[PDB]
Every structure is written in C-alpha cells, then in structure tokens.
C-alpha cells in the first residue's frame, strides 16, 4: 500500500525493481545495493 520515507540517510534512496524489491540508489555514489545502509 502507500508508502513514505522511513528515515534514510543524504543520498540514500527508497525503491523497489519492476518485481518489487526492496532496494536503495544512491545519488551521490550513484551506485545501487540491496543491503540495507540503516541495518547493514
């Protein structure tokens, strides 16, 4: 359903893939990783 911004980082974006998963892109590093950067 609707979904907001948790509480990520400067740069760290929220997004989930054509399939929907949860994944983050980063602006600034402009590189995308599927751990998470709050838990890690």
């Known amino acids: ?3 907001g911004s948790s ?3 400067e ?3 929220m997004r989930f893939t ?3 998963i949860p ?3 980063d602006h600034n ?3 995308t ?3 998470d950067p709050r838990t890690g």
């Open 11 to 13: 740069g760290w974006e």
């Open 7 to 9: 509480g990520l980082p």
């Open 1 to 3: 359903g609707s979904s």
């Open 33 to 35: 990783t599927y751990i």
């Open 18 to 20: 054509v399939d929907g």
């Open 23 to 25: 994944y983050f892109v």
């Open 29 to 31: 590093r402009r590189t």
